[PDB]
Amino acid sequence: IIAAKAAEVRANKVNWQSYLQGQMISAEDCEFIQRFEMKRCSEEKQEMLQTEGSQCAKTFINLMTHISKEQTVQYILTMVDDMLQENHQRVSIFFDYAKRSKSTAWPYFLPMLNRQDPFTVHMAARIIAKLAAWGKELMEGSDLNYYFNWIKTQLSSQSDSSQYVQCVAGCLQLMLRVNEYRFAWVEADGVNCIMGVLSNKCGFQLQYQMIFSIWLLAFSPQMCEHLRRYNIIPVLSDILQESVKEKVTRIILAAFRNFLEKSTERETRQEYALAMIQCKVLKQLENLEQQKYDDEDISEDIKFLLEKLGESVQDLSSFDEYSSELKSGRLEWSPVHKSEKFWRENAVRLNEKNYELLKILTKLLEVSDDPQVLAVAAHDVGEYVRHYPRGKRVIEQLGGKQLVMNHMHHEDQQVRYNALLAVQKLMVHN
C-alpha cells in the first residue's frame, strides 16, 4: 500500500508559494524548499543542507504543521524518507535543528502521528524510527511511551490496514535493532500485541516481521528470559508447518537457535527445549537437515538446533531425571520414555533402592487418576521386562503383570493400548 502512494507523491508536486502567499508559512521556509527542489544533484543537496541546515527541518515542520492538503506534506515526508535512503546520515540535520532550537527532536514530530492520513502518519513513523535509531538522541520516557503506544494502537486495528501494519512492524524492528528500545518494548505490553496479531492470522510478510522481532528479543539474554511469559514456541512450531517459505522458515530457525543459545540458565534451556520436543520440533529439524537451502544460516542453525535438542534429550533421558519424574508424577511422554538407548542403558536402574522405581510405577497403576500417567506406568512396567529379563518375576511379585493385563480393559483406550503393549513386553518370551 505504501509504494504506489509514495510513487504518486514523488510526482504530485504543487506550488509551495500558494501557502506563503496565504501567510501560513514563512518566506525563508518557502525559499528553502524551492531551492532544495531545484538543487537536486547530491553535491547541491549537501550544499543546501550545510548552508541552510537550521532552516531545513524548520521548513519541513512548518509546512507539515500548517498544510491542509496532503500532497505537499506527503511530498516532504517522502523526500525525507528517500533522502535517508540515499544517505542514512540525513537524520543529523533534524538533530542540529533541534539543538539550535534548544529542544529535543520528538515534540516536533510525535503529534503528526495523530493526523488523519494513514500514508502521512506512517511515513512520519518511518522517519521517526530512522531518526531515533541512527541518531545519538534515543527516545525516552513519556515520549517513547507514546510512540510505542501509537505502534500498539496501529497494531490494535488487527487488507490495506495490514499493509500499513507492515510499516508499523518495520518501525518497531528498526527501533528494536538498538537495545534500549528492546527493553522498552518488553516493559510495554507490545510483545503481547505481537502475540495477539500473530494469533489473529496476520499476513505472511507480517509473520516474518514479528518473528524478526522475537528473534531480536531472543538475541538478548535478558529479553530471551523475559519473553517466556508468552511462550511463542507452541504457536511457531505448528505455524512452521504452513510457512514453508524460505524467509519465515529461516527466521523461525534463527529464533529457535537464539532461544537455546541465550537462555540464561540450564533450567531456561530445559524449559525452551521441552516446549520444542513436546511440540515435536526434533523430527522437523531432522527433516530440514535432510533438506538443503540457499545460504549458510538455515542449515547451520538446523545443525546447531539438532546438537542442542539432542543434548536436551539426553539430559531428560538422564537416570536421575527418570527417577525424578517418577517421584513428581510427570509420566507424560518425556523423551526418556521413548529413547530406546536410555532403556537399554538404564533398565537395571529400576532395581535401585530395592526396586523403588517399579514400586512407584505399580502404585501409580492403581493410584493414577490421569489416564496418561496410568498408561505410561503400564508401558514403562512392560519396558522394564523387555529390557531386563529377570524383571519378569519382579513384576509378577509387584502385581504389574496382573495390573497391566487388567488395565488393557481400562476405561480409556489409550490406557488399554499401552497396557496391551506392556503385556506384549511381558510375553516377549517365556
Partner: protein, 48 residues
C-alpha cells in the same frame, strides 16, 4: 503416521510368532503332565 503404522504392524507380527512358538511347546507340556498322572497312579499311595 505411516512409519509408525508399519513399525507396529511388524512388531505385532513378530510377537505373534514368538508367542505361538512358546505356546505350542507349553501346551504339549500340559498334556504330557496330565496323562503322566494316570501313568503314575497305579499304586501311588505313598507321598512320592
Amino acid at each position: 503416521n505411516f512409519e509408525k503404522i508399519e513399525n507396529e504392524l511388524k512388531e505385532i507380527n513378530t510377537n505373534q510368532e514368538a508367542l505361538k512358538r512358546n505356546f505350542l511347546e507349553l501346551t504339549e507340556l500340559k498334556f504330557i503332565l496330565r496323562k503322566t498322572q494316570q501313568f503314575f497312579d497305579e499304586m501311588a499311595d505313598p507321598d512320592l
